[model samples]
Target: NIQVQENFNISRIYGKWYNLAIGSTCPWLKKIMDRMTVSTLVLGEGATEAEISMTSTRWRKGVCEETSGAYEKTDTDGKFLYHKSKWNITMESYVVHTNYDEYAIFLTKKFSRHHGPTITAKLYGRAPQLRETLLQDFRVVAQGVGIPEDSIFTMADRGECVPGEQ
Candidate 1:
């Protein structure tokens, strides 16, 4: 079983975490998230939320599209019931690893005809770049969680974060 954080701190996790790598069984999602970044917010009462935006600069100018969701603390300390606002579905996710300041790794399990029983792994860092050891750590966790190695893909920083709705 994957080790969950015993005393997860929601405060330190607030802010931005750049996508350093992403792994999913769905190629379509894999392609879309090639250059994505995330920004998290504390919703208080130990609850949290986040926005995930992607960038594609192959056009005249960089373009960004974003999706968001909120996390309600589960009975477990480091686990949460996730609801992706953009999708009409409920999800359960766990924070497998995090140092707050340097990096974080979260694993999500998706179920549905469209999404199937796929587990998504995301690695985030404080900056666009992260140490190799951190990347290795993510892979180790992914392996422990049964995410296939072939499905894992390293991510690149988009360097563009679209402004949130006013």
Candidate 2:
């Protein structure tokens, strides 16, 4: 049912991004697409440091967001079967389960306190947005998830990676 497990370009995922819209896509996103954002992450422990970080952001349409966590290799194939099950390396696995194909969400416990999944976050990625094709896709996906067509808020791109402001 869930197709969020589709492969992504891990190499280009690192960097800073602003949130475009949350809880599914809509009109409100135009204003904040330059603001709120999420990050992508990969987990690894090495002799050099606690964990070697990879690409920190995925910037496009003034919004840079990526899915990440204390991800571990699933060894499913050569692809990034890697999964980040926790919010961070220190926290317990937060991602309850994934749609296993396209989109996935995270949780602190098995049965989420609220709604069926309380999709705290969702991500959309692409090879390039020069033609501005992803916006439509975002809207479509949000609608499929039952997200209102006009409730989304956009983030402005201030070019900041830090949580507060960049």
Candidate 3:
């Protein structure tokens, strides 16, 4: 079963974060696994606690690609829903665990009409790097959610798209 952070506070975790490790069984993801680079997430408060605004930047073919979206909070404190209008897919995202100032683990389930549901677990940090122990902790959570060990891997930092850069 999936678990969300207890008494999760959206404001506390809002800010910049680094995408460190990810675990998934999605075919599309596997295709680009090796090209994965460290990404950045900038979280901002939305109109209400029921929503959060997010901007993401990552390197692709030596260029920094950016995307923005909003996550609508669910009835649960740490659960949210995100819809990708382009793909017509809705994802259920859960803040599995976070320590406000340091690290956070996110689990997202994507539903597609053609392709079955896909599970993705991501580990994020306040900075570009995180301790080894935290990476291991992410492994346990990823596996618990049925992500194969072979599919879990850390991303490489290519030193592009530094935070605050446009």
Candidate 4:
């Protein structure tokens, strides 16, 4: 029965929020595909927009990566809301290389635990497929609280969102 505030401040939501799922959109990298991962949204100050970086728990060896972009408020009425407004997101790609460990053997090889972040980024496109909306509907009688958008990252039963399940 966990629920986030029905009123979400778009600006406050700029950090990592991992998906609490065993399988996500990017499935090839199971080594980094954390079963209880969450998406990380980063809202760097004074920047035009923010970034989202998600990763799994160390157990899965899931490497977290992400892209950056600008987000402008979507126009609903003549009134313009700054932080409260839902954004028209655009993603950007970055060309990055890492050399934290050019060589390190498995469990036996001791290497510094350096967590790498996302590199590749690109401008976002207006594609319906990429669009997702969080639910704010009210089944008022049941409880004073409401449900989360895309509760289960997998969208199976379109369940509830359990933040930081891991």
Q: Rate the local accuracy (lDDT) of all candidates.
A: 0.65, 0.36, 0.89, 0.24
Candidate 3 lands at a TM-score of: 0.92
Question: Per-residue CA lDDT of candidate 4, range 1-166, in tens?
Answer: 2222243344443333322222212223323432433333333333433322322122213443343434333332111122212343222221111111111000001112243221111111111112232111111211221212222222122222333555
lDDT, candidate 3, 86-156, per-residue tens = 99999999999999899999999999878989999989999989999999999999999999999998999
Structure candidate 1, residue pairs in collision: none
lDDT of 2 by residue, 1-166 (tens): 3332345333333333223434433233334544454433333442243232333454445555543433332332112322233422122122222332333332211122332432223343221111234455555555555566564433343443432244
TM-score of each candidate?
0.73, 0.42, 0.92, 0.24
Each candidate's root-mean-square deviation in Å?
5.1, 8.9, 1.9, 18.8
- By lDDT, the best candidate is 3
Between prediction 2 and prediction 3, the one with superior lDDT is 3
Query: Over the stretch 21-111, how does candidate 1's per-residue lDDT look in tens digits?
Result: 8777655666675444443222233222333222222211354444444567666766767665566666667778889988888887776
Off by over 4 Å in 2: 5-19, 24-69, 73-111, 120-131, 161-166
Candidate 1 lDDT at 19 equals 68
Model 1 gets an lDDT of 0.65
Distance from true position, residue 134, model 2, in Å? 1.3
TM-score of candidate 2 relative to the true fold: 0.42
